Amino acid sequence: EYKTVVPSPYVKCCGASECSTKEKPDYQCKVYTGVYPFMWGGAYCFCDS
Amino acid sequence: SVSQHFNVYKATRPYIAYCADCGAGHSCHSPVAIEAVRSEATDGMLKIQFSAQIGIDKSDNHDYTKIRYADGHAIENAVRSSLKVATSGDCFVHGTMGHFILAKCPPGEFLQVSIQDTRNAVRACRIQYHHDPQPVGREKFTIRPHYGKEIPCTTYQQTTAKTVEEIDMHMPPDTPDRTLLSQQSGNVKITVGGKKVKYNCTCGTGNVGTTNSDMTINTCLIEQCHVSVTDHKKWQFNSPFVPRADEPARKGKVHIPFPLDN
Amino acid sequence: PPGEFLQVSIQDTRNAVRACRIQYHHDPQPVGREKFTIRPHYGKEIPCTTYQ
Amino acid sequence: QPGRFGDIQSRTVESNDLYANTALKLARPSPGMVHVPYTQTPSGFKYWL
Ligand SMILES: *[C@@H]1O[C@H](CO)[C@@H](O[C@@H]2O[C@H](CO)[C@@H](O)[C@H](O)[C@H]2NC(C)=O)[C@H](O)[C@H]1NC(C)=O
Ligand SMILES: *[C@@H]1O[C@H](CO)[C@@H](O[C@@H]2O[C@H](CO)[C@@H](O)[C@H](O)[C@H]2NC(C)=O)[C@H](O)[C@H]1NC(C)=O
């Protein structure tokens, strides 16, 4: 039996990110644009979109 | 030594995560959010991982009757005689250490872990986990008989010694806060509160940086600036429910308790 | 939770227990096409009716 | 093949290499939240057992 390792997501405010491929079994990475994360205190970044 | 066994735990702190159901079907932010459940042993001894640490006080010291949990920006303590685990009935807690609870439960469908607060409130987190045990052998019994046979099986020991299995440790990210702002006539006053604060304002020019005091910025509205706590000298567990800091590198390793034994 | 009967109990001034117990066949099926029990952390929004 | 015997493969117990095929798919996070949504066919070893 196996397990799935997923690290904490990277959130970048007022910028752009691009992930490179690594040599790991069934490695899946993706980048999503237009996010407005929230936390217990408040908004995470000024940048709306 | 037993007190010496938590030498690594002097460099870790609990956290607050996102619990989908915390008692009344309302998604909330909880200090006892569950992360994963492991049931490798054929005995049926569930091992549960959750944010709150058991066995350490706020003064960063060994104590077996206290549980330290994150609350706001600080760390509070709760009595250890007020921890409940339930699947369909009241379970039985066998062992605890730090991030992990080793217990046993009757058959059910959902797993719920509850603790008490300083104000005598109840903080609980409940997830779905289809659990039913089948004992080793060819008989589906429930209670150990007083005369029978011995079969090898796998269980979890209560020894807290060092083990191969490890968990990762990462730098906690900056937590935004909006209770550190005040409006006075036509200016915004921000308070240190004893922690480093990173601030970014849009009004004016050159109103961005980091501070450790109480400042006032003139001709600025309260919605025009963001402040965030940035000290975070301790280490936090790498969880998918919290954002990752700027550094994408591993920061530490912590040995897991309760290995698997025959 | 699901069950066959219903009991409602309070405490008296003399610290006694006063309870009533009736039969009511309760088995709630969540709306939609999935028979789940716990709300997930990722899914879809579907209209439903509740008590305010 | 995913969902059946042999989803996770290894030459030996101490081998450092591994072959994996389990159809790990990522999804876009829900608005106003921080999390990573992923869908994956369950382990074939448990089903075979
Ligand atoms: C402080 O916040 C401002 C926005 O309120 C950030 O300025 C943005 O920077 C990005 C990066 O090029 C630009 O694309 C945006 O157009 C800028 N917004 C505005 C309104 O000018 C600024 O980067 C933030 N600074 C820090 C240190 O976080
Ligand atoms: C159950 O007992 C077996 C037999 O001793 C253990 O399996 C052996 O573990 C040692 C560890 O040093 C290996 O060198 C042997 O190769 C294993 N035997 C076989 C046949 O593979 C097993 O570890 C015990 N169970 C647990 C949970 O410890």
CA distance B108 to B130: 7
Q: Is the CB of B154 under 6 A from ligand 2?
A: yes
What is the SS3 assignment for B10? helix
Between the CA of residue B31 and those of A43, B18, B52, B129, D27, what are the distances in Å?
Answer: 20, 9, 6, 20, 26
Q: Is the CB of B212 under 6 A from ligand 1?
A: no
CA distance C43 to B97: 34
Q: With contact defined as beta carbons under 8 Å apart, do B78 and B116 qualify?
A: yes
Looking at ligand 1, which atom is closest to the CA of residue A13? 28
Q: Is B14 exposed, middle or buried (0-12, 13-18, 19+ CB in 10 A)?
A: buried
Structural element, H or E, at residue B200 = strand B197-201
β-partners of residue B29 are B18
What is the stated resolution of the deposited model, in angstroms? Answer: 3.5
Ligand having the closest approach to the CA of B226: 1
Q: What are phi and psi of A46, to 5 degrees?
A: -65, -40
CA distance D43 to B254: 27
Q: Give per-residue burial for B195-226: e unless 16+ CB within 10 Å, then b.
A: ebbbbbbeeeeebeeeeeeebebeebeeebbb
Record: contact D38-A4, CB cut-off 8 A: yes
What is the SS3 assignment for D45? helix
Closest-CA residue to B182 (of B213, B217, B211): B217
Q: With contact defined as beta carbons under 8 Å apart, do B17 and B237 qualify?
A: no
Closest-CA residue to B5 (of B158, B187, B172): B158
Within 13 Å of residue B47, how many CA atoms lie on the same side as its CB? 19
Record: contact A10-B244, CB cut-off 8 A: yes
Q: How far is C20 from chain D (nearest CA, A)?
A: 45
β-partners of residue B101 are B48, B96
Record: contact A37-B175, CB cut-off 8 A: no
Closest-CA residue to D34 (of B175, B224, B129, C34): B175
The Cβ of residue B5 has, within 10 Å, a number of other Cβ atoms equal to: 17
β-partners of residue B75 are B70
Distance from residue B43's CA to the centre of ligand 2 (Å): 17
Pairing of strands B108-116, B236-237: unpaired
Sheet containing B122-131: order of strands: B84-86, B108-116, B122-131
Structural element, H or E, at residue D47 = helix D44-48
Between the CA of residue D1 and those of B63, B219, C2, D5, D49, what are the distances in Å?
Answer: 50, 65, 39, 8, 16
Residue nearest atom 3 of ligand 2, based on CA coordinates? B262
- What count of residues does chain C have? 52
What is the SS3 assignment for B9? helix
Structural element, H or E, at residue C8 = strand C3-11
β-partners of residue B56 are B62
Pairing of strands B122-131, B155-156: unpaired
Q: Is the CB of A14 under 6 A from ligand 1?
A: yes
CA distance B110 to B24: 14
Technique of determination: cryo-EM
Strands (E) across chain D are located at: 8-9, 19-20, 25-26, 38-39
CA distance A8 to B120: 33
Q: With contact defined as beta carbons under 8 Å apart, do B117 and B125 qualify?
A: no
Q: Is the CB of A49 under 6 A from ligand 1?
A: no
Amino acid at D15: S
Which of A6, A39, A44 lies at the smallest CB-CB distance from B240?
A: A6
Ligand having the closest approach to the CA of B199: 1
Q: With contact defined as beta carbons under 8 Å apart, do B202 and B225 qualify?
A: yes
CA angle D42, D45, D49 (to 5 degrees): 115
Distance from residue C5's CA to the centre of ligand 2 (Å): 50
Question: Which two structure tokens, joined as six digits, stand for B71?
Answer: 């609350």
CA dihedral C37, C39, C41, C44 (to 10 degrees): 110
Question: Which two structure tokens, joined as six digits, stand for B199?
Answer: 């601030």
Most informative mutation of B174, B201, B202 for ligand 1 (most atoms within 8 A of CB): B202
Residue nearest atom 21 of ligand 2, based on CA coordinates? D13
The contacts of residue B24 (CB under 8 Å, 6+ apart) are none
Sign of the dihedral defined by the CA atoms of residues B34, D37, A37, B254, in that order? positive
In chain A, which among 1-49 make CB contacts under 8 A with chain D?
Answer: 1-2, 4, 6, 9, 11, 25-26, 28, 30, 32, 35-39, 44
Q: Is the CB of residue D18 less than 8 Å away from at least one CB of chain B?
A: no
Distance, CA of A28 to chain centre = 12
Q: Is the CB of residue B86 less than 8 Å away from at least one CB of chain C?
A: no
What is the SS3 assignment for B6? helix
Q: Is the CB of residue D13 less than 8 Å away from at least one CB of chain B?
A: no
Q: With contact defined as beta carbons under 8 Å apart, do D38 and D24 qualify?
A: yes
The Cβ of residue B240 has, within 10 Å, a number of other Cβ atoms equal to: 19
CA angle B139, B142, B144 (to 5 degrees): 90
Conformational region of residue A46, where left means phi above 0, alpha means psi within -120 to 50, and beta covers everything else: alpha
Give percent helix, percent strand, percent coil of chain B, each to the nearest 5.
5, 45, 50
Question: Which two structure tokens, joined as six digits, stand for B182?
Answer: 């005040």
Pairing of strands B252-255, B236-237: unpaired
Distance, CA of D45 to chain centre = 11
CA distance A30 to D26: 8
Chains B and C touch (3+ CB pairs under 8 A): yes
Q: For residue C20, what is the DSSP state?
A: E
